């Protein structure tokens, strides 16, 4: 009997004032929240933000919407949301959000007989996440989502995670290319501004960066160029001056590689770990070039001393490079 | 009682003309303003602007909204703002702005018993900031936000910073990698257009650019290539192929660096500090190559003079480069 349902729903929305919260003038209305993380698409060090898609569900009680005589949950057309009171929830650290609207607005309204309202949205949001890149790319970040009431203070509205630590689902399914989600945490607290105290829910993720891409992308070319520079020590010297030209060309190519590398990162003002490694490699190749320059300079009149210097550099350079690698990889891991 | 407040608000909005300002036809209405800065996402020289996010709060008194019998301040659902008069405040130098609308429009309306309205918005605006880049990257910028009334002249409306020097908060939340905030300033004045005189508030920041990134990514490759260009002086002048290869390689690496770096900036017509530095380094390496050209020219009839010239160049080139760097860094710092 759809006519009785229609009459009941018309009666519920008769004289209904959406300008007033439930229990206006009385105790605060409690709003529970749940999030299903569908995906975390892109994490950007350049923009210091991440994108996230989620199903965001709010739960509250409105005694003006209690009905009797119908033993069913009432799922209503989402446009009824424009005729009801809803919480004024927003995200502090977001930069650009939107509700999906294909084929219709991705919104859900479900009434329960006792007056309980379930209000669901599907939201894609980009949110700010400041990152500490001092140990990049061996770094670990903490990205948060802050959820707050905009207009209502703690005297009017209260937030709580519905289900405790189970209120956020779908995190374990997330696969990120550059990161892995070590842990996620849920916090509830209050925040005081000049206009009063407001409830706050925080959802934080800890992300650890995978190293394989950087081993394949930046560390190996530098190591291989440094090793290549040592091939010179096993070639007999001549009056040609071939090897100083070769060394200079290799150093220049190293610089070119380094400039592109940095052409792929944000403009942070401090030194990163990869920067430290790259300038260590540059110091090594420059010292190799200087050593060959010296040997070529002195070999015309002192061939024996030049041969001894070359042989000792044959031994000293691999040992010192291994020591530098040991120290670097022990200080950062 | 919710019905008593409901009928109070219905009486408040009964007979309310939204087309008329408070005290229309009488003394001007005074509007106080507060700004809480959340972040400055980015500052772009290519587009000559910056993006600012803020809570913008307006305070005024509308006698038509005064109510009695309720010793409380009514925090209303923000949709009621569509039924009230609000100031026609705009930003003169802004290019694209939006009010955040997730989960609802980030808007707040609070009424007080005597008729005071507090109206809050969360706004992200990209505002223009013309920059003088003659000292770039050692430059200092001044970026402003101009707040004005569009339709109402000074005979209708007045603006003032509510709280004086404390009207703008959150300046310490501004975290820019490439800049630091030195000072902020608040100004109130009037601006005369052909349609009358209008109130104008101004909020300005002074940005100082951090030099660390440019030392690491621009100056160092040029310095290292210039130093590498001096290795030719220590090579005997019989090695024509090696030294010619050295000079050509250095020249092409300098040209690639220069073209990329200038390609990454706006096409300003004037010369920046980094441009003058790069051109000086190019001049030094080109002069070293021309020095070798001269030595090759004269060494077949005056070998002793050519050897003396190389010996003196070894000392002279680093000395003149150090003098050039000293003068440059004294002038620009």
């Amino acid at each position: 009997n759809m006519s009785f349902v229609k009459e009941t729903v018309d009666k519920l929305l008769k004289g209904y004032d959406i300008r007033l919260r439930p229990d206006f003038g009385g105790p605060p209305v409690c709003v529970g929240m749940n999030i299903d993380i569908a995906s975390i698409d892109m994490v950007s060090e350049v923009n210091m933000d991440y994108t996230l898609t989620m199903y965001f569900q709010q739960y509250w009680r409105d005694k003006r919407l209690a009905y009797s005589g119908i033993p069913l949950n009432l799922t209503l057309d989402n446009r009824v949301a424009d005729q009801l009171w809803v919480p004024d929830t927003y995200f502090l650290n977001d930069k650009k959000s939107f509700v999906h609207g294909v084929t219709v607005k991705n919104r859900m309204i479900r009434l329960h007989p006792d007056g309980t309202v379930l209000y669901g949205l599907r939201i894609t949001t980009t949110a700010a996440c400041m990152m500490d890149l001092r140990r990049y790319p061996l770094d670990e970040q903490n990205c948060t989502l802050e959820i707050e009431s905009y207009g209502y203070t703690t005297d009017d509205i209260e937030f709580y995670w519905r289900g405790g630590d189970k209120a956020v689902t779908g995190v374990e399914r997330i696969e990120l290319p550059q990161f892995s989600i070590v842990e996620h945490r849920l916090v509830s607290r209050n925040v005081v501004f000049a206009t009063g105290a407001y409830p706050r829910l925080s959802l934080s993720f800890r992300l650890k960066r995978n190293i394989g891409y950087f081993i394949l992308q930046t560390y190996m070319p530098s190591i291989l160029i440094t090793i290549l520079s040592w091939v010179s020590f096993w070639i007999n010297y001549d009056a040609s001056a071939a090897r100083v030209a070769l060394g200079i060309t290799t150093v220049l190519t190293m610089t070119t590689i380094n400039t592109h590398l940095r052409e792929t990162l944000p403009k942070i003002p401090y030194v990163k770990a990869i920067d430290m490694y790259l300038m260590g490699c540059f110091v090594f190749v420059f010292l190799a070039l200087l050593e060959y320059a010296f040997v070529n300079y002195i070999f015309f009149s002192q061939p024996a001393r030049a041969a001894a210097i070359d042989r000792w550099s044959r031994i000293v350079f691999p040992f010192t490079f291994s020591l530098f690698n040991l120290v670097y990889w022990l200080y950062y891991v | 009682n919710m019905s008593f407040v409901k009928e109070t608000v219905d009486k408040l909005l009964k007979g309310y003309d939204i087309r008329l300002r408070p005290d229309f036809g009488g003394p001007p209405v005074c509007v106080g303003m507060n700004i809480d800065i959340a972040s400055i996402d980015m500052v772009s020289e290519v587009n000559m602007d910056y993006t600012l996010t803020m809570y913008f709060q307006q305070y005024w008194r509308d006698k038509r909204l005064a109510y009695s019998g309720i010793p409380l301040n009514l925090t209303l659902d923000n949709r009621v703002a569509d039924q009230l008069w609000v100031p026609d405040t705009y930003f003169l130098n802004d290019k694209k702005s939006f009010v955040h609308g997730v989960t609802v429009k980030n808007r707040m309306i609070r009424l007080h018993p005597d008729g005071t309205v507090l109206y809050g918005l969360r706004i992200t605006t990209t505002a223009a900031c013309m920059m003088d880049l003659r000292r770039y990257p050692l430059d200092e910028q001044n970026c402003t936000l101009e707040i004005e009334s569009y339709g109402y002249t000074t005979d209708d409306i007045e603006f003032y910073w509510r709280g004086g020097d404390k009207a703008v908060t959150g300046v310490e939340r501004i975290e820019l990698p490439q800049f630091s905030i030195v000072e902020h300033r608040l100004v109130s004045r009037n601006v005369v257009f052909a349609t009358g005189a209008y109130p104008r508030l101004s909020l300005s920041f002074r940005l100082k650019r951090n030099i660390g990134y440019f030392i690491l990514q621009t100056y160092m490759p040029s310095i290292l290539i210039t130093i590498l260009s001096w290795v030719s002086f220590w090579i005997n002048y019989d090695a024509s192929a090696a030294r010619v290869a050295l000079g050509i390689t250095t020249v092409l690496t300098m040209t690639t660096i220069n073209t990329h770096l200038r390609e990454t900036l706006p096409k300003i017509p004037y010369v920046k500090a980094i441009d003058m530095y790069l051109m000086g380094c190019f001049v030094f390496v080109f002069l070293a190559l021309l020095e070798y050209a001269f030595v090759n020219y004269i060494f077949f009839s005056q070998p002793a003079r050519a050897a003396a010239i190389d010996r003196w160049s070894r000392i002279v080139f680093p000395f003149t480069f150090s003098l050039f760097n000293l003068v440059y860094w004294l002038y620009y710092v």
Partner: nanobody
Amino acid sequence: LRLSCAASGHTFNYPIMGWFRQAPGKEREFVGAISWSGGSTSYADSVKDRFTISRDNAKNTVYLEMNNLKPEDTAVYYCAAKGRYSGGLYYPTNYDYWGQGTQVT
């Protein structure tokens, strides 16, 4: 006189340090706040031009120098850390990690 607050651990997640003082009969009162990186200080009216706050990241220390004292400056002093999205700068509720109390007469 000079008070030093040395912080260790996750100072990146709490980029703001603040100073408070508690009177024997009054509540905690905000004195000043300093940003770890930006070096942008903020002061209360009662200690403007008199108290100064400085930060050094070498050993992660913040110094409060108190000059031109008064008998109305006899309160137990505290240092605290504030989160990135913790709200207003003048409210003790918004500060998470509190240091040990220090007495001044």
